[PDB]
Amino acid sequence: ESADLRALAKHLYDSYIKSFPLTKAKARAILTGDKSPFVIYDMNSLMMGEDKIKFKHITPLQEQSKEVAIRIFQGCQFRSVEAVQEITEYAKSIPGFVNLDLNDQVTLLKYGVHEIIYTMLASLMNKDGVLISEGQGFMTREFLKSLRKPFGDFMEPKFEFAVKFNALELDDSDLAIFIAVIILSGDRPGLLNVKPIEDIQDNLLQALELQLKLNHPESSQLFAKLLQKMTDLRQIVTEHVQLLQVIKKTETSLHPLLQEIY
Amino acid sequence: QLNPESADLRALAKHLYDSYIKSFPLTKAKARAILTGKTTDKSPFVIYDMNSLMMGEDKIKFKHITPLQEQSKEVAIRIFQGCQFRSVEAVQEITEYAKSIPGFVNLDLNDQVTLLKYGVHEIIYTMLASLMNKDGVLISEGQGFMTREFLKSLRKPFGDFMEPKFEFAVKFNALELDDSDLAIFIAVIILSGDRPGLLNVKPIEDIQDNLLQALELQLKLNHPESSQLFAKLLQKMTDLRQIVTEHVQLLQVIKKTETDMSLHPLLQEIYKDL
Ligand SMILES: CCCCCCCCc1ccc2n1[B-](F)(F)[N+]1=C(CCCCC(=O)O)C=CC1=C2
Ligand SMILES: CCCCCCCCc1ccc2n1[B-](F)(F)[N+]1=C(CCCCC(=O)O)C=CC1=C2
């Protein structure tokens, strides 16, 4: 299967490039240095970001959008909903995924997206900030903590995680297989037929292993260090879910249909 | 076949296995022999109720579990106290096992303490697995056995500390690991690096890297028929964080309902800021 593990690597990688717009390599050239991004570092660079970046897709809903930080978080959610559809599409590219019990595919997706969103979010951030709206922007890190209430402490966890994660220096070729592994997680609650999901992940894990040893001769035991990060992820996700609690001690095209889209 | 390279990782394995046997009285091997029946002299006294909870104190040695403290209006707490002194003892053994891990004592004394502070519990529940089956857990060096049901019926809060452990033990035992594997695994666990506040991550990492290499070689050599057990084992480390956190997130609650119950000092310096 030495060749059968490359076939799978190349294939996943192709679906990855086709399902995701902004890639690792991509977002990396931007973060480090033609068309520089618009940096959001304070209140005015944001108010100015609204129109300029036109990312406003998430804003136009007049009457609700009137308090900063609610509008940023609201934007964290619109792009998230977007990404879920991209993740879902990538899933179907994973050999055997489509052939599983439909309830399980939904279940795998229901619990795998949050882990996949943070993994990729790392591709878009550095110790100093995160790339937003397709790459047209860069919302600084300090500004994010500059948000108040539980808001100014929800992005700082992910920055800490991203820093450790990106240190592994993984590329799109690598992440593609990693993303799939997370999806084919046989321990998600409510699964009806775990065997098939495990066979697939294992077949995926072999390919990831071969992928990491060929692409990073230099880094000993990278396979192991990467699998360990799945721990940081679960904490990051459980933590995140807690943040969604207090944010209820906050509020709660008219909103009555927005709430239902999320 | 076998080259300079591997040969070194194999000696590390034999080295840790040997320290592990030397550090923990009740190994998985002994524990399995007790639970399965290859014995007429190792059979445990079963506790599934007060009737036998009472009987137990008689046949199987205690009052080293039940420290200076007569009884207590209810059993749920007396057990708890036991699992407390036993746990602190495990920390002790785990601590002597750590020292044997090559390079571990050569690190900054503060780092050493950090690895133990977070490693101790993940290691306790890993080993605690060895003493369990879907139906219960061995106690008192193997002399007793407390049913999974007795434990889940205990008083409202206390009858809730052990189920998650059983939940993990069953999944984890399905890996069918043995003492020689666990020794290397428990070793990787201590030598994390991503532990909070570590003053010097590099050396810690260079060590784990080697242990991971030893574990990878051990697993394939020991479970050739078990594909990706290496990765499957690493993924298990997340169930541990969750067991740990859940426990701590259960400990605090008792620190209010029971203003009269006590925590071992040590045991507090572990959970502090956990
Ligand atoms: C190929 C790209 C992979 C997709 C990455 C995952 C979704 C984006 C996301 C999640 C959290 C978060 N970000 B956030 F939502 F993007 N976000 C923002 C601002 C959002 C701007 C709109 C955008 O990026 O599309 C601020 C913190 C934060 C934090
Ligand atoms: C690295 C070493 C770790 C291996 C496992 C040793 C720790 C055992 C432990 C921890 C919690 C717990 N158990 B427990 F303590 F084993 N426990 C009991 C048994 C009480 C026995 C009382 C006696 O010793 O006489 C009941 C719940 C519980 C719950």
Curated annotation (Swiss-Prot), chain A:
Ranges for domain NR LBD: 4-262
Expressed in which tissues: Highest expression in adipose tissue. Lower in skeletal muscle, spleen, heart and liver. Also detectable in placenta, lung and ovary.
Motif (9aaTAD) on chain: 256-262
Subcellular location per the Swiss-Prot or TrEMBL entry: Nucleus; Cytoplasm
Keyword Magnesium listed: no
PTM (free text): Phosphorylated in basal conditions and dephosphorylated when treated with the ligand. May be dephosphorylated by PPP5C. Ubiquitinated by E3 ubiquitin-protein ligase complex containing FBXO9; leading to proteasomal degradation. Ubiquitinated at Lys-18 by TRIM55 leading to proteasomal degradation. Ubiquitinated by E3 ubiquitin-protein ligase STUB1/CHIP; leading to proteasomal degradation.
Subunit note: Interacts with FOXO1 (acetylated form). Heterodimer with other nuclear receptors, such as RXRA. The heterodimer with the retinoic acid receptor RXRA is called adipocyte-specific transcription factor ARF6. Interacts with NCOA6 coactivator, leading to a strong increase in transcription of target genes. Interacts with coactivator PPARBP, leading to a mild increase in transcription of target genes. Interacts with NOCA7 in a ligand-inducible manner. Interacts with NCOA1 and NCOA2 LXXLL motifs. Interacts with ASXL1, ASXL2, DNTTIP2, FAM120B, MAP2K1/MEK1, NR0B2, PDPK1, PRDM16, PRMT2 and TGFB1I1.
Associated disorder: Defects in PPARG can lead to type 2 insulin-resistant diabetes and hyptertension. PPARG mutations may be associated with colon cancer. Obesity: A condition characterized by an increase of body weight beyond the limitation of skeletal and physical requirements, as the result of excessive accumulation of body fat.
Protein name: Peroxisome proliferator-activated receptor gamma
Organism of derivation: Homo sapiens
Region of the whole protein represented: 235 to 501 of 505
